[PDB]
Write a protein that binds this ligand. Structure first.
Ligand SMILES: *[C@@H]1O[C@H](CO)[C@@H](O[C@@H]2O[C@H](CO)[C@@H](O[C@@H]3O[C@H](CO[C@H]4O[C@H](CO[C@H]5O[C@H](CO)[C@@H](O)[C@H](O)[C@@H]5O[C@H]5O[C@H](CO)[C@@H](O)[C@H](O)[C@@H]5O)[C@@H](O)[C@H](O[C@H]5O[C@H](CO)[C@@H](O)[C@H](O)[C@@H]5O)[C@@H]4O)[C@@H](O)[C@H](O[C@H]4O[C@H](CO)[C@@H](O)[C@H](O)[C@@H]4O)[C@@H]3O)[C@H](O)[C@H]2NC(C)=O)[C@H](O)[C@H]1NC(C)=O
Ligand SMILES: *[C@@H]1O[C@H](CO)[C@@H](O[C@@H]2O[C@H](CO)[C@@H](O[C@@H]3O[C@H](CO[C@H]4O[C@H](CO)[C@@H](O)[C@H](O)[C@@H]4O)[C@@H](O)[C@H](O[C@H]4O[C@H](CO)[C@@H](O)[C@H](O)[C@@H]4O)[C@@H]3O)[C@H](O)[C@H]2NC(C)=O)[C@H](O)[C@H]1NC(C)=O
Ligand SMILES: *[C@@H]1O[C@H](CO)[C@@H](O[C@@H]2O[C@H](CO)[C@@H](O)[C@H](O)[C@H]2NC(C)=O)[C@H](O)[C@H]1NC(C)=O
Ligand SMILES: *[C@@H]1O[C@H](CO)[C@@H](O[C@@H]2O[C@H](CO)[C@@H](O)[C@H](O)[C@H]2NC(C)=O)[C@H](O)[C@H]1NC(C)=O
Ligand SMILES: *[C@@H]1O[C@H](CO)[C@@H](O[C@@H]2O[C@H](CO)[C@@H](O)[C@H](O)[C@H]2NC(C)=O)[C@H](O)[C@H]1NC(C)=O
Ligand SMILES: *[C@@H]1O[C@H](CO)[C@@H](O[C@@H]2O[C@H](CO)[C@@H](O)[C@H](O)[C@H]2NC(C)=O)[C@H](O)[C@H]1NC(C)=O
Ligand SMILES: *[C@@H]1O[C@H](CO)[C@@H](O[C@@H]2O[C@H](CO)[C@@H](O)[C@H](O)[C@H]2NC(C)=O)[C@H](O)[C@H]1NC(C)=O
Ligand SMILES: *[C@@H]1O[C@H](CO)[C@@H](O[C@@H]2O[C@H](CO)[C@@H](O)[C@H](O)[C@H]2NC(C)=O)[C@H](O)[C@H]1NC(C)=O
Ligand SMILES: *[C@@H]1O[C@H](CO)[C@@H](O[C@@H]2O[C@H](CO)[C@@H](O)[C@H](O)[C@H]2NC(C)=O)[C@H](O)[C@H]1NC(C)=O
Ligand SMILES: *[C@@H]1O[C@H](CO)[C@@H](O[C@@H]2O[C@H](CO)[C@@H](O)[C@H](O)[C@H]2NC(C)=O)[C@H](O)[C@H]1NC(C)=O
Ligand SMILES: *[C@@H]1O[C@H](CO)[C@@H](O)[C@H](O)[C@H]1NC(C)=O
Ligand SMILES: *[C@@H]1O[C@H](CO)[C@@H](O)[C@H](O)[C@H]1NC(C)=O
Ligand SMILES: *[C@@H]1O[C@H](CO)[C@@H](O)[C@H](O)[C@H]1NC(C)=O
Ligand SMILES: *[C@@H]1O[C@H](CO)[C@@H](O)[C@H](O)[C@H]1NC(C)=O
Ligand SMILES: *[C@@H]1O[C@H](CO)[C@@H](O)[C@H](O)[C@H]1NC(C)=O
Ligand code: NA
Ligand code: NA
Lengths: 355, 363
C-alpha cells in the first residue's frame, strides 16, 4: 500500500510544467498525422493553462539561441520535462575547432542555477536585455553551427565586433535575473596559442564585481565557457579589458518569492540511436530537486522519439494530486507506507508499525 | 501524544555542538565558584567528545579576531549555540567614525554562509592562510576597538600598510595565497566603505580575489552610497582549493588570514541553531536568525528573557530546556520542533528531517 510512485505530480492545483514537443499541444497543427500520440502528457491537460512547451525547444536553447520560445509560467510546484533539444546529438560548438563537451558543461551549469532558483520563486519568464555602448562597433554572430540540416545561432551573450570595451545594461522588473558570463577558452588549432579573453560584470550600485578570464589550461578545442550568475535589479557595466566585449541579451526573470518548494525534473532524452546526456541529472540535486526517469530506452510510438509508454507513465501523475513528494517518488496518501519518505515535501506518511 | 518539542537533538549519536561559555566544560577551571550552573548543557555531555566550545568566543569572533579559538568538529547533525560574544553590546567598529551596524551585516552574512555549508559537510575547522608578497610593506592592525574593558583586534583579513615614507611605486598591490587541505574554504572579501571624518569625501577601496587556475574573479569596490560611518564591509566567499591572487588595484591591499575549512561531504542534513543572546540588560541581535533559514537550518528560541542563575547571562532554565534534547535521540527534526516518535502526532512535521510521524486520522 502507498508505495512511492515513479511520477511527477502536485499537492494541489498550483503547479506548472515547462516542456518541449512531448508536452506541446499546439504542435499537432504542424504535423501531417494529426493526433496527440507524439505527446507524453495526457491531452486533457491541454486546456489546464499550466503548460509552457514548444516543439523543438528547451529552456537552455531559448536562453542562448535565436530559435527562441518565450517560456513563461507561474506556480508553487514547478516541473520540467525538457532538455533533449540541446544534446550531443545536436552537436553544437561555436567554431569548427570547438567542443561540444564545453556546451554540455554550460548546460549543466545553466540548469543547476535554474532548478535551484525555481525552488524559491513562483514565476519564470525570459526577458530581453538592452545595452548602451559609446562606439560604432555592432553585434556579430561569432558562435554558430550547422548540424542535422538545422543552423543554430547563439545570440546570448551578444558579441560586439571590433574599440570601446565596455557597455552598460540595466536589470529591472524581476527579483533576480539569470544571465550568462562567458569567455572563449582554448588554443587555436593551427597555431596552438591560447585565446585571450576577459569579461567582467560590475554592479555600479553595490560595487560587486563578477569576472571570468581565459586561462592556459589544457582543454584542447576553442569554445565558449559560460557561468550563470543570479543577479539583482540594478545598473551594471560589462567590461572586457580591451578584449572581446560580450553583454547579456536575455535573462531568466525570476519573480514572486515563495517558501522553499522543490522542483521536479523528468529525464529528457532521445531514443538511443541518438546521443543524449545526463546534464540535467547533474543539475537536479537534493533538497531542491527531484529527478524522475524510466528504466528503459525511449521507445516512441509516434516516431522513435515521441510517445513513450514509460515517460507517459511518469507524466501521468499530473492528472491527480498526491500527498507528498520525495526522493524515491510520490506518495499518493498521507497516512502509512512501507517505506520512509526521503527528503519529503508535503503531508507525508509514516512507515512505522501502527500498534 | 508526540507533540513537537522545543529542543535541539539528534537522530543518532553522530552529532556535534559548537558553543561558548554556556557549553564550555573547561571554563569551570577559571571560575571562583566551581560548579556547572553557568552551563545551559547537561554536564554529563562533557565527556561525549561532541563539543567544541570556548568561553568568551564565537565562530565569527575566532574567524575575524586575534582572540582565537580553533573551533573544530565533525558530525552528521550539526548544532550551534553561539554568537552572543559578538553583539551590539560588544560594540565593535574598525574606527572611531565606524559603525556597528556594518558589523551586524557582516555577522549575518558570515553565518548565512556557514549554516548553508554545514548542511553539506561533516567537518569544520579554522585554518590559517599565509601569503607571499614581493614588497617591503607589512601587516597593520587597521581595525580595532576598545569597549567593556576588552580590546578587540581584527586580524582577518590582513591589511598591508603602505609605507608613506617610501615612493608610491614601492607599494605592491597584490599578494598570492594558496587554499589547500579542504573541500571548500570560507574566506572574507572586504572593503572600507563610507565618508572620512569631517569630510564629504568617500573612502576609495578595491579588493579582488582571482583564481589563477580557473580564471574566476570575485571583486568588491567601495561606492559612494550614503551609509553612516566609515567601516569594513565584508562578503563571505566559499572558495575551492587552488592558487589565488589578492589584488587591490593600487589601493589598500587585504588578504585572508583565516578560513573555515569545510571537509567530508554528506547528503543534505539541516543544521540546528539556538538563539544566542544576553540577558536583556545587554543589547543582543537577531543576525543568526536572519542566517538560519529553511530548508538548511532550524532555529530554536525560548519565549522569555535570558535569566541566568549563575549570573544574569549564564544558566537559563528555558535555554537549558532547549539544550536538554542533546541527551536523547529523536525520530524527526522539523521547523516547529523535534518529534520524539516516528509514528503519529497531532501536527504535521514541517520541512522534516528523519523518520517522521503522520498526523492523518488512522482508520
Ligand atoms: C530581525 O530583527 C529585525 C529588527 O527588529 C526585524 O526587522 C523588523 O521586522 C519588523 C517586523 O516585521 C518590521 O516591522 C514593520 O515595520 C514597518 C515599517 O517599516 C519601516 O519603518 C521602520 C521605522 O523606521 C523609522 O525609524 C528609523 C529610526 O530608527 C529611521 O531609520 C527610519 O528612517 C524611520 O524614521 C522615519 O519614520 C519615523 C516614523 O516611522 C519618523 O518618526 C522619523 O522621523 C522618520 O521620518 C524602518 O526600520 C523600516 O526599515 C526597514 O525596511 C526598509 C525598506 O523596506 C529597509 O531599507 C530598512 O533597512 C529596514 O529593513 C521601514 O522603513 C511597519 O509598517 C510594519 O507595520 C505592520 O505591522 C505592524 C506590526 O507591528 C502593525 O502595527 C501595522 O499595523 C502594520 O500591519 C511593521 O511594524 C520592521 O520594519 C523591521 N525592522 C528593521 C530594522 O528591519 C527582522 O524581521 C528580524 N528577522 C528575523 C529573522 O527575526
Ligand atoms: C527569542 O525570543 C525572545 C523572547 O521572546 C525574543 O525577545 C524579544 O525581543 C523582541 C524584539 O527585539 C522584543 O519585542 C519588543 O517589545 C518591546 C516592549 O516589550 C517590553 O516588555 C518585555 C516583556 O514583554 C520586556 O522584556 C522588555 O524589556 C520590554 O520593555 C517593544 O517596544 C518593541 O517594539 C519595537 O519593535 C516593533 C516590531 O517591529 C516595532 O513595531 C516598534 O515600533 C518598536 O521598534 C518590540 O516589539 C521583546 O521585548 C523581547 N521579549 C523578551 C521576553 O525579552 C527574541 O527577539 C527572540 N529572538 C529572535 C532572534 O527572534
Ligand atoms: C487537486 O486539487 C485541486 C485543489 O487543490 C483541484 O483544483 C481545482 O481544479 C479546478 C478545475 O476546473 C479549478 O477550477 C479549481 O479552482 C481548483 N480548486 C481549488 C480549490 O483550487 C484539482 O481539481 C484536484 N485534482 C483532481 C484530479 O481532483
Ligand atoms: C555607463 O554608465 C557610466 C556610469 O554611470 C557612465 O559614466 C558616467 O557618464 C557621465 C556622462 O558621460 C559622466 O558625467 C560621469 O563622469 C560618468 N561616471 C563614471 C562613474 O564614470 C557612462 O557614460 C555610461 N556609458 C554608456 C556607454 O552609456
Ligand atoms: C583579466 O584579463 C584582463 C585582460 O587580459 C587583464 O587586464 C590586462 O592585464 C594585462 C597583464 O597584466 C595588462 O598588460 C593589460 O594592461 C591589462 N589590461 C587592462 C585593461 O587592465 C586582467 O588583469 C585580468 N584580471 C586578472 C585579475 O588577472
Ligand atoms: C535514465 O534511465 C536510463 C535507462 O535505464 C539510463 O540509461 C542507461 O544507463 C545505463 C547506466 O549508464 C547504461 O548502461 C544503459 O545502457 C542505459 N540504458 C538505456 C536503455 O539507454 C539513463 O542513463 C538514465 N538517465 C540518467 C540521467 O541517469
Ligand atoms: C585547527 O585545527 C585543524 C584540525 O585539527 C588544523 O588543521 C591541521 O593543520 C595542519 C598544519 O596546518 C595540517 O597539515 C593538517 O592537514 C590539518 N589537519 C586536518 C585534519 O585538516 C589547523 O591548522 C588548526 N588551526 C590552527 C590555526 O592552529
Ligand atoms: C596561526 O596564526 C597564529 C597567530 O596568527 C600563530 O600563533 C603565533 O605563533 C608565533 C610563533 O609561531 C608566536 O610567537 C605567537 O605568540 C603566536 N601568536 C598568537 C596570537 O598565538 C599560530 O602559530 C598559527 N598556527 C599555525 C598552525 O600556523
Ligand atoms: C575598482 O576599483 C579600482 C581602483 O579604483 C579600479 O581600477 C582603476 O580604475 C580607474 C577608474 O576607472 C582607472 O583610472 C585605473 O586605471 C584603474 N586602476 C588600476 C590600477 O587598475 C577598477 O576599475 C574598479 N573596478 C571596476 C570594475 O570598476
Ligand atoms: C490511508 O488512507 C487511505 C485513503 O483514504 C485509506 O483507504 C481507505 O480505507 C477505507 C477503509 O477500508 C476504504 O473503505 C476506502 O475505500 C479506502 N480508500 C482507498 C483509496 O484505498 C486507508 O485505510 C488509510 N490507511 C490507514 C491505515 O488509515
Ligand atoms: C515573455 O513574456 C513575458 C510575459 O508576457 C514578458 O513580460 C516578456 O517581455 C516576454 N519576453 C520577451 C523576450 O519578449
Ligand atoms: C553523468 O554521467 C557520468 C559518466 O558518463 C557519471 O560519471 C556521472 O555520475 C553522471 N551523473 C549523474 C548525476 O547521473
Ligand atoms: C507510537 O509509538 C509508541 C512508542 O514506540 C507507542 O507506545 C505508541 O502506541 C505508538 N502509537 C501508535 C498509534 O502506533
Ligand atoms: C604569484 O603567482 C604568479 C604566478 O601566477 C608568479 O609569477 C608570482 O611570482 C607570484 N607572486 C608571489 C609573491 O608569489
Ligand atoms: C541514540 O542512538 C544511538 C544509536 O542510534 C545510541 O547508541 C545512543 O545511546 C542513543 N542515545 C540514547 C540516549 O538512547
Ligand atoms: Na569578453
Ligand atoms: Na582593498
Amino acid at each position: 500500500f502507498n508505495e512511492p510512485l515513479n511520477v511527477v505530480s502536485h499537492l494541489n492545483d498550483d503547479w506548472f510544467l515547462f516542456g518541449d514537443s512531448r508536452s506541446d499541444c499546439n504542435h499537432i497543427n504542424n504535423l501531417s498525422q494529426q493526433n496527440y500520440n507524439y505527446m507524453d502528457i495526457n491531452p486533457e491537460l491541454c486546456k489546464s493553462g499550466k503548460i509552457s512547451a514548444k516543439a523543438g525547444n528547451s529552456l537552455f536553447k531559448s536562453f542562448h539561441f535565436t530559435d527562441f520560445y518565450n517560456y513563461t509560467g507561474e506556480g508553487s510546484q514547478i516541473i520540467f520535462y525538457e532538455g533533449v533539444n540541446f544534446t550531443p546529438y545536436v552537436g553544437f560548438k561555436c567554431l569548427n575547432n570547438g567542443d561540444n563537451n564545453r556546451w554540455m558543461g554550460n548546460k549543466a551549469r545553466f540548469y543547476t542555477q535554474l532548478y535551484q532558483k525555481m525552488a524559491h520563486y513562483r514565476s519564470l519568464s525570459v526577458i530581453n536585455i538592452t545595452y548602451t555602448y559609446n562606439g560604432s562597433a555592432g553585434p556579430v554572430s561569432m558562435c554558430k553551427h550547422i548540424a542535422n540540416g538545422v543552423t543554430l545561432t547563439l545570440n546570448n551573450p551578444t558579441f560586439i565586433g571590433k574599440y570601446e570595451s565596455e557597455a552598460n545594461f540595466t536589470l529591472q522588473g524581476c527579483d533576480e535575473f539569470i544571465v550568462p558570463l562567458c569567455v572563449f577558452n582554448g588554443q587555436y588549432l593551427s597555431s596552438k596559442l591560447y585565446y585571450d579573453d576577459s569579461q567582467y560584470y560590475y554592479n555600479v550600485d553595490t560595487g560587486v564585481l563578477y569576472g571570468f578570464n581565459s586561462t592556459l589550461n589544457i582543454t584542447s578545442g576553442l569554445d565558449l565557457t559560460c557561468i550563470y550568475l543570479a543577479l539583482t535589479p540594478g545598473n551594471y557595466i560589462s567590461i572586457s579589458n580591451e578584449l572581446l566585449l560580450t553583454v547579456p541579451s536575455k535573462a531568466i526573470c525570476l519573480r514572486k518569492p515563495k517558501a522553499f518548494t522543490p522542483v521536479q525534473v523528468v529525464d529528457s532524452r532521445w531514443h538511443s540511436n541518438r546521443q543524449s546526456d545526463n546534464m540535467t541529472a547533474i543539475a537536479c540535486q537534493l533538497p531542491y530537486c527531484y529527478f524522475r526517469n524510466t528504466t528503459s530506452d525511449y521507445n516512441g510510438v509516434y516516431d522513435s522519439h515521441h510517445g513513450d509508454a514509460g515517460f507517459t507513465s511518469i507524466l501521468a501523475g499530473l492528472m491527480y494530486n498526491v500527498s507528498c513528494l520525495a526522493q524515491q517518488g510520490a506518495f499518493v496518501y498521507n497516512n502509512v507506507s512501507s517505506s520512509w519518505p526521503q527528503y519529503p515535501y508535503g503531508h507525508c506518511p509514516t512507515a512505522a508499525n501502527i500498534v
